[PDB]
Design a protein around this nucleic acid. Structure first.
Ligand SMILES: CC1=C(/C=C/C(C)=C\C=C\C(C)=C\C(=O)O)C(C)(C)CCC1
Ligand SMILES: O=C(Nc1ccccc1)c1cc([N+](=O)[O-])ccc1Cl
Ligand SMILES: [Zn+2]
Ligand SMILES: [Zn+2]
Ligand SMILES: [Zn+2]
Ligand SMILES: [Zn+2]
Lengths: 289, 9, 363, 10
DNA sequence: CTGACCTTTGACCTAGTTTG
DNA sequence: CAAACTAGGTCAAAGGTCAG
């Protein structure tokens, strides 16, 4: 009938919003379903003819997009108690393991974080590579989320996991007061004004731990699951020990954004502090950075 | 190396 | 007056074979009988909604048969006493759902929705019609390189600076408009105007950004992004191609968008979620916090119930969608560390004076 | 303080 | 993996049914 | 009968196969 606006072959219909030959139609369809990511070995400048279109997939698919081939057009292949994450192991785990002055406590608490992580259900049960990745991706966020809870009863300053009350002032001058303020008000306060028990903080740290996005996770589907498990678990928990407050589960999960905003800022700092060499940073902190 | 050590055992 | 189907839940096209069925099932059935088709067996009780429908021919030709659907009860003619069921689905079962306190949560959900529709033009609804091609519109002019850009950059025009600089400098007016819409939507959130006008501004300074990427995802997909009202479609690959620091500018948003779209949230759902972002008592520079947080408390209350009703089967979605609030924060802080780079290595930045205000002292 | 604007305008 | 080849869907349109 | 509906046919367009 028409000519496939992709290679020149005979169209014989409109497919995915474009006059296309059967071949191209099927190329596109599969690319979309099997979620494939092609790569051009040449200059992304490959011609696509009735012949030599099968030459390079990347250029061919992009030729589809250009010629307006719609992806959402491809339909979807026609086929086919509540304590898997016990709140106890968590709590029990969040228990048994407890500027230049902060990097000492940081590093120290790093060795002990591998311990905490080991105790969190199913963690050590999934591949060692992911155990690395998961801890690489979120050590700073984890660590901050814990000392921040510790500095809960403490006033306008934090208590390093070694015993060093770092009162605000000390920091605003130490150069890093910009962030030290946010850590107090967006984490400490919020947690204190909410009386976040340490079973909850453990579940939050777990949620941070089981991060399915963390680049490289052999099987991320696995991770996105243990996380949903902690979701289910903690939700119920707040339901049992906190009936008066329905919107608690929500307000707890909403303590996480800031944890990451802040977390990112910190890492930003430890860098223009690292390959500078003006202050001491131990070993474990070097592998993490 | 390190993290992989505390995990390797 | 606008019921739905009894086999898959799509909109019903009429009373076919003694039961409200979509123009899709109606045909499936009339064709199973018509050709005697004997679909292979299958035990797994298969849920049957709009998309899974064509997943199992046996469970579909089952469920329908299991709720009427007879080549007998085909009642022709004009609807004689609509009244009986012209009180929609929940009629007397409504004075049970249209109550108690939730009756109002339902109201709020509607308000924010009806308001969301008047605030922003291109809704998720539309953008999807376009990206699915199921619209009586012309396919948006795809922009995958310099030739296509140079071309469509004229087709629908309103300063030769640079491709990489035109691409992003030139969208600044949408960001602005966007910011303007959000703002008018903010006022539509019960109790926003009342909050100390000083925190009112703070809540936005930090809100718009996250709300922008949430919207900016409806227009996106794995391969590209809608633009220019939705009459254009720039490719993910082309953008990824811009110079030095401009290629990995829109990347973080595509990754985020591909994930955020997995939740499959519609305008009704997105209209509330959004409201929750603007009302986050955890924004720096707030002192009249409690108020701000009270509304979020109730908005969240509304949101949760909306996800249960709208998306009956979707494990931990409420908790899953909240988790997204955390990815949003990262995107913004990340996006800022970038616009900082530009500030130091570029010489044309020249941000609009409003994007100027918002970005000042952000993160 | 240009947002104060849009916020303070029917 | 491709793609010639072959089955399904379901959005519309139409000719016949039933209510007022 | 005009008005209000529907079973049924229709065919572009989307799905599936399986030698090559
Ligand atoms: C938070 C913070 C920073 C970074 C440190 C990190 C990433 C972890 C610290 C962990 C501790 C102190 C754990 C403990 O012992 O409980 C910097 C230096 C930029 C300045 C002050 C704020
Ligand atoms: O350039 C964009 N956004 C932006 C640029 C600088 C600072 C903040 C946002 C952009 C925005 C939109 N939008 O808002 O709908 C669409 C497309 C682009 Cl490329
Ligand atoms: Zn072709
Ligand atoms: Zn190529
Ligand atoms: Zn149906
Ligand atoms: Zn089945």
């Amino acid at each position: 009938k028409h000519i496939c606006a992709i290679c020149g072959d005979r169209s014989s219909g409109k497919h995915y919003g474009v006059y296309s030959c059967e071949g191209c139609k099927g190329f596109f369809k599969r690319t979309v379903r099997k979620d494939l990511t092609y790569t051009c070995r040449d200059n992304k400048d490959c011609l696509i003819d009735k012949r030599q279109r099968n030459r390079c997939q990347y250029c061919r698919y992009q030729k589809c997009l250009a010629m307006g081939m719609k992806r959402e057009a491809v339909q979807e292949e026609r086929q086919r108690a509540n304590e898997d994450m016990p709140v106890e192991r968590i709590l029990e785990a969040e228990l048994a393991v407890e500027v230049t002055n902060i990097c000492q406590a940081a590093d120290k608490q790093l060795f002990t974080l591998v311990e905490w992580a080991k105790r969190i259900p199913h963690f050590s049960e999934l591949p060692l590579d992911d155990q690395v990745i998961l801890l690489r991706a979120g050590w700073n966020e984890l660590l901050i989320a814990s000392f921040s809870h510790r500095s809960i009863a403490v006033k306008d300053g934090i208590l390093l996991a070694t015993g060093l009350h770092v009162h605000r002032n000390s920091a605003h001058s130490a150069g890093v007061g910009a962030i030290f303020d946010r850590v107090l008000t967006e984490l400490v306060s919020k947690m204190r004004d909410m009386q976040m028990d340490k079973t909850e903080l453990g579940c939050l740290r777990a949620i941070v731990l089981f991060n399915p996005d963390s680049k490289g996770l052999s099987n991320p589907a696995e991770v996105e699951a243990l996380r949903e498990k902690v979701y289910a678990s903690l939700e119920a928990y707040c339901k049992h020990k906190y009936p008066e407050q329905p919107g608690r589960f929500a307000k707890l999960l909403l303590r996480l954004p800031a944890l990451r905003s802040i977390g990112l800022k910190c890492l930003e700092h430890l860098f223009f502090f690292k390959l500078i060499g003006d202050t001491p940073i131990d070993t474990f902190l070097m592998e993490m950075l | 190396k390190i993290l992989h050590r505390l995990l390797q055992d | 007056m606008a019921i739905e189907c009894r086999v898959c839940g799509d909109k019903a096209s009429g009373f076919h074979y003694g039961v409200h069925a979509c123009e899709g099932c109606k045909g499936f059935f009339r064709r199973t009988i018509r050709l005697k088709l004997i679909y292979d067996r299958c035990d797994l009780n298969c849920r049957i909604h709009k998309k899974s429908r064509n997943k199992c021919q046996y469970c579909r030709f089952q469920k329908c048969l299991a709720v009427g659907m007879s080549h007998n009860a085909i009642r022709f003619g004009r609807m004689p006493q609509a009244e009986k069921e012209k009180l929609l689905a929940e009629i007397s079962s409504d004075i049970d759902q249209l109550n108690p306190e939730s009756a109002d949560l339902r109201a709020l959900a509607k308000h924010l929705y009806d308001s969301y529709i008047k605030s922003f033009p291109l809704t998720k609804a539309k953008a999807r019609a376009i990206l699915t091609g199921k619209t009586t519109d012309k396919s948006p002019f795809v922009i995958y390189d310099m030739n296509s850009l140079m071309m469509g950059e004229d087709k629908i025009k309103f300063q030769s600076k640079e491709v990489a600089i035109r691409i992003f400098q030139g969208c600044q007016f949408r960001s602005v408009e966007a910011v303007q819409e959000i703002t008018e939507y903010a006022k539509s959130i019960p109790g926003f105007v009342n909050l100390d006008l000083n925190d009112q501004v703070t809540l936005l300074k930090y809100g718009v950004h996250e709300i922008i990427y949430t919207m900016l995802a409806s227009l996106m997909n794995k391969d590209g992004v809608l633009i220019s009202e939705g009459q254009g479609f720039m490719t993910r690959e082309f953008l990824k191609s811009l110079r030095k620091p401009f290629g990995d500018f829109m990347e973080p948003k595509f990754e985020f968008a591909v994930k955020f779209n997995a939740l499959e949230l519609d305008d009704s759902d997105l209209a509330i979620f959004i409201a929750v972002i603007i009302l986050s008592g955890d924004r720096p520079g707030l002192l009249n916090v409690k108020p701000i947080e009270d509304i979020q408390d109730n908005l969240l209350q509304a949101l949760e119930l909306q996800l249960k009703l709208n998306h009956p089967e979707s494990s931990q979605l409420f908790a899953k969608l909240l988790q997204k609030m955390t990815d949003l924060r990262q995107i913004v802080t990340e996006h800022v560390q970038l616009l900082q780079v530009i500030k130091k290595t570029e010489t044309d930045m020249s941000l609009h004076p409003l994007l100027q205000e918002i970005y000042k002292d952000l993160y």
